[PDB]
Every structure is written in structure tokens, then in C-alpha cells.
Amino acid sequence: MRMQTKLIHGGISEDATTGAVSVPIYQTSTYRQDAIGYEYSRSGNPTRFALEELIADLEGGVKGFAFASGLAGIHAVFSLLQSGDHVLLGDDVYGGTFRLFNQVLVKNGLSCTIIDTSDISQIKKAIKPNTKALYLETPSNPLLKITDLAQCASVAKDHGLLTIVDNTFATPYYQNPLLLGADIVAHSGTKYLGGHSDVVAGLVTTNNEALAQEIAFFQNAIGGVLGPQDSWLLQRGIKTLGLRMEAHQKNALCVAEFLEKHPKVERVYYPGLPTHPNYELAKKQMRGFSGMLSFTLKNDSEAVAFVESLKLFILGESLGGVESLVGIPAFMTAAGIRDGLVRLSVGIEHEQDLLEDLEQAFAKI
């Protein structure tokens, strides 16, 4: 089977015993045993396991892991490290990942270095003797900066390092870090994966047998596990991923090219524009660009006004749902991040209506 069939029949997609074409929702905490010696839903749940087998299946991993949130996943990953350990980080990583390091992992003995991941020499310049991991996020939030995964994972592998890739923006449908040399892939399932702005989840998967028990252990020992209801909803959502990503990309390309040719707009940030820094690299490691774009307008004070006069676009705090979201990283989630930077999550509505909502909003500034 191919990717789009896999989205539907991949992982575990059926109930063996009943023939049920969906995985049963296992609202249980405990299972009867049949001799002294599934045991507990913190360590094992058939509904979560189905979901986990599915993400492993999509990223080409040996095991999947489902978490209460994206951050519970990322946390569980970095729990593989001891105190005195050093980690290299992208300079515009998701705000919560940086906060995690700053205020949680530091207080417990880990250190970091903020580098430019598109500058492969900067990563070389920063490897300390106690460095153990490299954390990559491409495309990036909110500038959509592209990082060469294969090359980073190469630099990383010949040093004793771990390649950890937050693959949220480009989904397993568009990018597959594990097939480029990465060791661990992390997702916020809150976003594109479930796709309906109705589930908070995290997903992690890995190439490596040993890393798999390591993650397994800390998923269960720290206990940040995803519930069966959420698991089931996320898997349900994954079934339409292919269709949703195609439409996300179609709409995003239309919006990107609308903003680029627009007088009131200065810079557009989107991986699918040929004038995007590293467009060639993007095409080589991604099979598509997603729905995420930010843009900056010439008159920088008029940002709040523009965002607030949008009717169809929803002024909200997340991304990657069927509904379009609008945001200003400065006042929400310096370094390119002018305060007049508007970040659209382009959804799956009709492109004409999405273009019309942007027209009417510019026509007010």
C-alpha cells in the first residue's frame, strides 16, 4: 500500500475480534489477568496502541508513543539525558520548547546553545565535549526557515549525537526525518495531525530499538500519556491527512502569491515561494509545503487593525486545523520577528473566500 492507503489501513485500523472497521475506544484502567505473573492503561491501552502503531507506520519508525500534549512528548524525549548534558537548539524554536529547556530541563542539569540550524557551520562551531543531542525544527515557527536535515543528521551522526526533529508543520505526509538520518521524530498532534482543532496530543516515534525502550520507559514513568478518547479522535483525524494537506498547500500557495504581489505587504514567509531562502533544499527534502505562512506589512503599526478586521480568519492561539487561524507572534507565541509580523494558518475553506477576507481587511488600512 501507498501513503494515502496507509493513512486509512495503516497501524492498527480494525478490531481483529469483531471486524469493526474502527478501533474500539477502550475506556478502561485495568485488565483481568489469567495467571499470577495489557496490565494497566498508563503502560498499555489498545486504543492508544493503535494510534501509536499508525504514527510509527507513517514516519517509518519501530514504535510510536502518544502523549497528553506535544510538550509532554518533547519533555519525555529530553528525559533520555543526564545532568551535565548539552543540547543544540534552533534559534527560532517553538516558544514552549525553549521555555521547557529554560525553566524545566535547566533546573535539572541540562544546558543548551541557541544556534542557526540553516548555518551548518554554526552547529559545528558549537559542539561541546558533553553535547549529546541536536534539536531541529523545519520548517520553523514563525519565519519558516528551512534546515538541511540530511546534512545536520550527518554532522550529528559522526559525532556521537542524537538527531531530534519536531516534524509538526510538514506532516509525515510531506517530510520523513527518519528516512534522512534523524533518530527521533516529535509531533504536536494538536495541530495538523488530528486536524480539527479539537484534540490536544503529542506523538513521538523513532528508528531505533534502544531509544524505543528509553522513550517507552519515560512515557510510562513520568505518566504524560494520551487518553483513549483523544487517541481515537486523533487517529480518526489522521485518516483525512492526505486530503487536508493537499488543500492546505493549495490554499497556502494561493495566499502566499496574493500577499507577495500586494502593495501593502513587504515580506512573505512561505516555503512554497521560489524566492524563499532555501527553496531548492525545501523541494529536495519535502514533498509539499504546508498551510503555514507569516507575512509582514509595510506599515508596521497597522498589524493589530488588519488581524482584527478579518472575519473568516479566526483570531486564535493555535494552528493546523480545517479552520483558518490568524496570529501575531509578538503578542502571542528581535530575530526577524518584527512586531508587525502576522502568521496565518491557512485552512481548508474555499480559496476565493480566504482571498476575499484578506481583501476586505487590507481595504481597511
Ligand X SMILES: Cc1ncc(COP(=O)(O)O)c(C=O)c1O
> Site map for its own copies, 178-207, x if CB under 8 A?
xxxx-------------------------x
Q: Where are the alpha helices (DSSP H) in 264-302?
A: 279-285
Q: Which of residues 322-351 bind its own copies (CB under 8 A)?
A: 330-331
Per-residue b/e over 202-216, b at no fewer than 16 CB within 10 Å? bbbbbbbeebbebbe
- Rounded CA separation 266/340 (Å): 10
Query: Minimum distance between the CB of residue 220 and its own copies, rounded to whole angstroms?
Result: 26
φ/ψ bin of 109: left (φ > 0), alpha (ψ from -120 to 50), beta (otherwise): left
Helix 241-260, helix 351-362: angle, nearest 10: 30
Long-range contacts of 353-357 (CB under 8 A, 24+ apart): 353/312, 354/251, 354/254, 354/255, 354/312, 354/313, 354/324, 355/254, 355/255, 355/258, 356/312, 357/310, 357/311, 357/312, 357/313
Near its own copies in 142-181, by CB under 8 A: 149-151, 153-154, 156-157, 159, 178-181
Interaction between residue 327 and ligand X (CB under 6 A): no
Q: Which does 111 bind (CB under 5 to 8 A by kind): its own copies, ligand X, none?
A: none
10-18, 90-98, 106-114, 263-271 -> range binding ligand X (CB under 6 A): 90-98
Cell output for 43: 503502560
Nearest Cα neighbor of 146 from 116, 172, 125, 176 is 116
Show the binding pattern over residues 42-71: x = contacts its own copies (CB under 8 A), - = does not.
Answer: ------------------x-----------
Q: Which of 57, 91, 166, 230 is catalytic?
A: 166
3-24: b (≥16 Cβ within 10 Å) or e: eeebbeebbbbeeeeeeeeebe
Three-class SS state of 136: strand
Candidates 26, 94, 135, 192; catalytic one: 94
Catalytic annotation present for 166: yes
Considering the candidates 40, 42, 124, 364, report the single residue annotated as catalytic: 42
DSSP state of 115: E
- Is residue 191 a contact partner of residue 168, using CB atoms and an 8 Å limit? yes
Is 191 among the catalytic positions?
Answer: yes
**CB-wise, 127 or 199, nearer to ligand X?**
199
Which of 45, 140, 188, 278 is the binder for ligand X (CB under 6 A)?
188
Contact call for residue 40 and its own copies (CB under 8 A): no
Q: Which is nearer to its own copies, 207 or 296 (CB)?
A: 207
Q: Report in angstroms how near the CB of residue 42 gets to its own copies at its nearest.
A: 29
- Binding piece for ligand X, criterion CB under 6 A, among 35-43, 89-97, 257-265, 307-315: 89-97
Nearer to its own copies, 45 or 167 (CB): 167
318 binds its own copies (CB under 8 A): no
Establish if 141 lies at the interface with ligand X (CB under 6 A): yes
Other beta carbons less than 10 A from residue 334's beta carbon? 9
Contact set with its own copies (CB under 8 A): 2, 60, 121, 124-125, 127, 129, 149-151, 153-154, 156-157, 159, 178-181, 207-208, 287, 301, 308, 330-331
Q: So which residues are the catalytic ones? A: 42, 94, 166, 191
